[PDB]
Amino acid sequence: AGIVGAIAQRDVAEILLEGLRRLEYRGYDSAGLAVVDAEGHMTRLRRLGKVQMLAQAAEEHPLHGGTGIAHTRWATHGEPSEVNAHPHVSEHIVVVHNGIIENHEPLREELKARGYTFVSETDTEVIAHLVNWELKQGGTLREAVLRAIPQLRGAYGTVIMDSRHPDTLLAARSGSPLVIGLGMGENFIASDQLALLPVTRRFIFLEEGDIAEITRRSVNIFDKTGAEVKRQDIESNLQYDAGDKGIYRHYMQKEIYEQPNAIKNTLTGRISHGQVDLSELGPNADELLSKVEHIQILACGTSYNSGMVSRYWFESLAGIPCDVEIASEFRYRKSAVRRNSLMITLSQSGETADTLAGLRLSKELGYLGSLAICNVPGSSLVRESDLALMTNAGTEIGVASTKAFTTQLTVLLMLVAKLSRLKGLDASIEHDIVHGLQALPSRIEQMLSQDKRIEALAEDFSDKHHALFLGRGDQYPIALEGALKLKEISYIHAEAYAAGELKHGPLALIDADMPVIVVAPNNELLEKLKSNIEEVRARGGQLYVFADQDAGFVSSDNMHIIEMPHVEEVIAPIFYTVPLQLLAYHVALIKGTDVDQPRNLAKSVTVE
Amino acid sequence: AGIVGAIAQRDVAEILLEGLRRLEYRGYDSAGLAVVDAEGHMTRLRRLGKVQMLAQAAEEHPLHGGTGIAHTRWATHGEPSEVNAHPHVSEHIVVVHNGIIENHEPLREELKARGYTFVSETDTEVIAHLVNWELKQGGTLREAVLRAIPQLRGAYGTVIMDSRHPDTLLAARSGSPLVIGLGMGENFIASDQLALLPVTRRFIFLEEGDIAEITRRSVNIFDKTGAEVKRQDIESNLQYDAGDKGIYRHYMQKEIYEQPNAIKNTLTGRISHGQVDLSELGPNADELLSKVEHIQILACGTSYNSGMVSRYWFESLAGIPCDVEIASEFRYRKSAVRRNSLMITLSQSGETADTLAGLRLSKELGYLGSLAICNVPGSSLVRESDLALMTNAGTEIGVASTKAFTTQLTVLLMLVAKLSRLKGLDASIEHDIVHGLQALPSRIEQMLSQDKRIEALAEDFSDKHHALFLGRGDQYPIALEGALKLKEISYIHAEAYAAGELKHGPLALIDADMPVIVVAPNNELLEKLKSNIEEVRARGGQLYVFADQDAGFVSSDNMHIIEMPHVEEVIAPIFYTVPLQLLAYHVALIKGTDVDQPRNLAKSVTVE
Amino acid sequence: AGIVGAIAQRDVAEILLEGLRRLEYRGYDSAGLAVVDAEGHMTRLRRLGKVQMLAQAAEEHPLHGGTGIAHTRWATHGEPSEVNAHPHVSEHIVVVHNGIIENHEPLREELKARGYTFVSETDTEVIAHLVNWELKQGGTLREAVLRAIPQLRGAYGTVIMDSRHPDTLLAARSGSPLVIGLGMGENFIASDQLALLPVTRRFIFLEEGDIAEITRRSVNIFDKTGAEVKRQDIESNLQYDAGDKGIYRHYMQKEIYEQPNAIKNTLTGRISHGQVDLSELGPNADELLSKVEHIQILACGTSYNSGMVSRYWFESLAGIPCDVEIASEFRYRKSAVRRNSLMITLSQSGETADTLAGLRLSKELGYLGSLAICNVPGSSLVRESDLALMTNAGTEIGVASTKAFTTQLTVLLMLVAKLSRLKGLDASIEHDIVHGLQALPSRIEQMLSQDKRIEALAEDFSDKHHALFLGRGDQYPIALEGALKLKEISYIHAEAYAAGELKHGPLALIDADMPVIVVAPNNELLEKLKSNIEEVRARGGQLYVFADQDAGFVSSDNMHIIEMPHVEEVIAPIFYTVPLQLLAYHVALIKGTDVDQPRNLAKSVTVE
């Protein structure tokens, strides 16, 4: 379940154990480690149970040495026991293993008929004995492993050492992940980079098939053949940019105006022959998804707002039950899991602590599985989910989310077709969805071209300290987002409310210092809201209405129609986000606030 | 439940009984009284059941004496029984008591060790034995009482007499009301002046912490230190001919303060044999309920807030899926009904147009059936639902709802047991809920007893135009309701947020004109939030924390701990509603806003 | 200039050298390191020139040992030479130091008299002997250090080890940054976190006045009184590889903190043998400059402010007439040129239209010639002038100028020696100037170390809409620039005035909404201003005073002294600029305004 390896000048056992602690979120039923001093004395220590047991034993009888491998196990072959736990040995050959060697018994009898005593049930032990064999005939660890790897079928990863030669480790990625961590005169490796953070941030991710020879001072990478490939050491990931601001003053402004392009990119590879094509999920996929009867979405901030929009879509268009929840609230409560529930997480950054906690928790609760909708490749939410859909918006530098939100919405709309319930309705539905998606980039462009009007409109808000945003249905979460945006970058106390709840409280607040915005109401809703604002005429209440030019609404003295171009219904919520983004942007511009880095806010909330 | 005491020249039994009769609106399961003659002969009579039984018993066997005390009991510790009814005795010490001694176990032990025999199951008996013990070492009843008080935890509201010295009563106002009634050559005391109207109209209201020593011809009041305190004696005009708000300035005030009795009425006939009893729903329905797999709740405003708490309850305590939605949102969208779904509506008035439309719409979407939780008999939601549970709160006249909310909560919590889907126990869950509910009224009185404190706190808010209310889990909808209340009757732009989401937007708004309130956080949460408010120290950000005194939280200069009495966790959400109602009320008083009829709001919104 | 320290199981020499490598971007002229093995054998290497030389020298040595310290030097006291490099020793005491011990002569004489031999010209060496002396009396290294710190006056970030006991390091911060890196069973320290990145991301920043005792496994921090103080370790969730802001939140912030190094770059190659070396100007430079009888300076904005400082310098220290004028005023009027007049333009960008026009016009007016002080090579102003001096501050991205201003001041101060006319009567003028210039970089760092206090002070201006900045003589243009900065990035209406003119008008304006700031006044001036603010106590007039702590100024209730460390008089105006820059920056942070791109301002005004 977890692998860790170190080759250093200092004692590495403490580091190995700490690595395993940090791998506890996965696995596991047993654990163990094996280290080696300079004289070649290998000390091995294994327990059935928690890592804490192993650390306990390790404490009162310390392991000394600068070379070592450690492992946490989730048994697949052989009952959980100290006997079957890793590392496994073949005399001087020591091995840790993740995944499965599929052809175990063939090779095990092959080697058994060669003098090898299999003391365990695991498929792993075969690895050890085989490496032993191949080393029997000259060469050293590398050549040998290079021969042995092809003789193992299966998705797996393994780290291998010879205690007669502590200066080298060998690794093999063949269906299960491994990453190397670069230290100073020492080097590490693990099944996930989470394990190496205490000790390094320089990583070399192995490619599928790669084989690595690691020393204190060197790291050589090859493939199945043995031909020295080179791999680069990433760290991040979220670089900026300059520069890439182009004709725009601010990262956030740029990110607003690139939304058509970002959406095009989100659509790329996912539309064909007038249908939604999510085949990128896998050959299976279309079959895990078929079993889903309920959707649970978890997110924070703006991502929560996108989830909130998607609920309306899933329930009305696809006919699937869908719940959306603040991740903080999910992780801290005992919940009731619905039958056949898909867990979806929404996250720009993929690192938000609350949302990650929610996903991990979901794993113990009996969810069908998880899908991450995310904007940053190789992030934690992505690595830890069963399925992932990247938004492809490009890096987003402004602290307030803009393109990340509209691309999230795009992907969520794409899921609707691929998850319908509710068949027969039906092709009319996926049809309308795809037509809308095809229209979307241009509709956004239309909307961006209203910027001068929105920029003029912002003068009505730049001296305000309160605002109320109203919305109904698939537009309520758009009002939420518009309010959040005004909070974020202009510091105005803007609050969103469901349109039908105005009379139940907020109406008592409305006056000249608290403008009311409604997002895309139909005529019936508007009549109701006009009547409401008439109730507070004597205090100078103003209604602002972003609405379809086709609707024919007529401005009055206390109600200002801000007409917009027509849109396909199915994408209207995405469309109507843009003006609210532009409004917040232009208010901030007038006030002179720090748009890209608003006070007290962070791009990503990753620590607790 | 009800206390009456008397000290006169004439016989007082008839007066004490008439007092009890006049206190009957406070739910009770039993009653008793004790009187002493000039010679020191003490007579006590106690009966299970109605005051009528007690009076009748007293008639065959007339009680002589000018000194006496009297009590109706609402059982919290020890079943209703003659054995457990008050007054309780420790030889010459005779005591009546309202409320809950938090440390009765340890005290009962220490007193048993000193040789006292406990004949009842009540916490109350420890008071009598403890006073008897402190009196052992000589002194005045007063000094003994003063010694006893510090060793007591919780609400020890009490009236005490020593049958050897019938010339004095001792009273301690702790946890519920006590009013002194001044006669001519006689004095009286009761938990409400209604009890005393037959004999006087001059009253002195006792405050939390006051201790009174009373004789026929004098009244001396002091705190636990001994220091005299002055309290003014007001004369009562009126009788109760006013459209009675009685002693209260506003209907909303009355309705906040009658919450204990309202709740008692909500429980009538619904607890039997230590279990929840909803047999009123009929045998036919207890069957339907076994079939429910999912709960759906529709409501508007404050009713929506109570539904929102219940979500957390049903999911964690009953392990059933529960969803809660604004009625207008549900009616105007096409939804996906869950398998075997119960439709629940919450509504004070039963006529709210959105909620009613929601019920009607649901009639054709395939729910198992509908249940209405309501406060108005005969109303639309009650007639059109399959089942109905009335809150029995009495009429609510204030436009903002208070007792309707807490009675709604009381019903919802009772529904938990009868809709349980967990296994094992489940049994202890229903026991905890039942004990919680039996304690709830006393708990509310303890909160009401904090009103002066809350009234001082209101000064920090009276001139604000913004506020942010935070809560996590089952306290988050309590923050919703707190904020709504401040909006409603004080016109302050108060907004509620999930505690976990503060860093995701609202933190950017916080400064001196926008105080932050947290409802009932644990230490981990308080730490996160404390760090947050540190982030906006430079802008004069203030954090106000309502929390359990037992938590041992400590104030700093920008974080203010408003400690509260300890309460059972299952009813903490109800309990913590009260200080938020009191806050809004007192802010409104300072500003002089129209509490009972806030601008632009209506009792119910019955028109489309 | 740079400090690194390590205490580990493994050898730390390579780690030390790599740290220094990562500190190299900071101006240095030499480097050294010293490491101690477990047997207490101490190996020390020092070399003149780049870190590369040090690393080579290390190539020959088996530098074993787990404890050590290392340093890059920027000489202030004693020529750059291997003899003068750090670490400096006193037998078993080994010491690295950033900053300036200015009571170094008293201490060196006292220690010489006590039997110590000073083998170097540095101020640093007295620390090594002093600690040595203090350990001679006994106690632990920590106690000796506590006794020694108080005897030091000035700036010191120092790390200190005893080769006889290599398991402990001591560090003290006062006027120069230190930060601790926490590892796995090893610990580290550095003057700059960038040096610790290869081995850890967990830091504890030492604050002003702190003293730390570091072992492999412990960190204990405390103040000069031995009183343990606590600091929070925090994971560094920073992306160091993200873009050009490096570790900073804002370009302007980075440009403020970069000021010491920018200044070192301005000084590079312009001090030779204790004298200003402007030979870069050409062989026949002194030829033109000798003829100059009068200086005319033209500039806009902040550049005009530096010019304005220089006027005082030129006239008082070089005794040449100097005139400074807003460029647009000069270009549009018919002026009367002085005889043998040198035309100097100051400009960060070299492209400002008014300034450029000024120069061009001067071409036809009979000036001896033109000198351009500029920060961008190849700019119009540089190309079109006879002589040019570049400030070498590196690119400046912030719209408001910071390092451009202080580097300009540095160049202008160097011109003073090369343009002298006091005969004299001189010699010591140039010596003083060169001394101040040598100290400048660490003096600026000393100011930066006061940032926490300036941050705190900012709360006092965060909500103000007016301010008045006062200065006299060479501090008056500093007030000009402080006031400009506050206008620029916080949008507060701040205005500077000559101190002596306060009573001639602005005094009428003063009240609580308009704080008064004085920069670096002497006692006589201070008393005048104190009386002035008295006149307006009744309207809430506050006087904030930035002054030398050596002056012994005492705060009243409406006069607030903000003490600053002593500095060389001749560079006092550059010194006092920093706190006004930091003030404006922190006010903008609190208000959340666009620091890097303030509303309506441009980096340079190039169009007519």
Ligand SMILES: O=C[C@H](O)[C@@H](O)[C@H](O)[C@H](O)COP(=O)(O)O
């Ligand atoms: O008013 C506070 C309550 O005590 C509340 O905190 C609840 O009892 C626990 O938080 C349990 O939550 P879960 O059982 O859902 O985890």
Ligand SMILES: O=C[C@H](O)[C@@H](O)[C@H](O)[C@H](O)COP(=O)(O)O
């Ligand atoms: O943004 C506006 C949309 O057009 C929105 O109004 C939605 O498409 C309809 O409300 C349909 O939803 P239902 O099918 O659930 O009624």
Ligand SMILES: O=C[C@H](O)[C@@H](O)[C@H](O)[C@H](O)COP(=O)(O)O
């Ligand atoms: O009040 C305005 C004056 O007319 C003033 O503008 C001045 O007389 C001219 O501008 C000429 O000045 P110069 O001769 O210096 O260009």
Ligand SMILES: O=P(O)(O)OC[C@H]1O[C@H](O)[C@H](O)[C@@H](O)[C@@H]1O
């Ligand atoms: O979407 P995530 O990366 O999970 O972050 C959720 C939220 O985090 C922070 O608050 C950002 O400032 C927001 O803009 C974002 O919406």
Ligand SMILES: O=P(O)(O)OC[C@H]1O[C@H](O)[C@H](O)[C@@H](O)[C@@H]1O
């Ligand atoms: O509870 P209901 O009768 O369904 O009414 C819902 C809401 O309507 C109005 O706004 C009242 O002022 C509220 O106090 C109430 O909560």
Ligand SMILES: O=P(O)(O)OC[C@H]1O[C@H](O)[C@H](O)[C@@H](O)[C@@H]1O
């Ligand atoms: O120094 P210069 O390039 O000639 O520019 C003069 C002024 O121009 C602009 O106003 C910049 O914002 C200033 O910071 C600068 O001082």
Ligand SMILES: N[C@@H](CCC(=O)O)C(=O)O
């Ligand atoms: N199949 C191997 C490895 C399991 C794992 O990857 O944890 C075993 O059971 O030992």
Ligand SMILES: N[C@@H](CCC(=O)O)C(=O)O
């Ligand atoms: N707790 C006490 C008092 C009850 C009451 O306040 O009525 C009892 O159970 O007897």
Ligand SMILES: N[C@@H](CCC(=O)O)C(=O)O
């Ligand atoms: N003043 C000391 C230290 C200089 C520095 O901070 O680099 C010296 O001249 O060596």
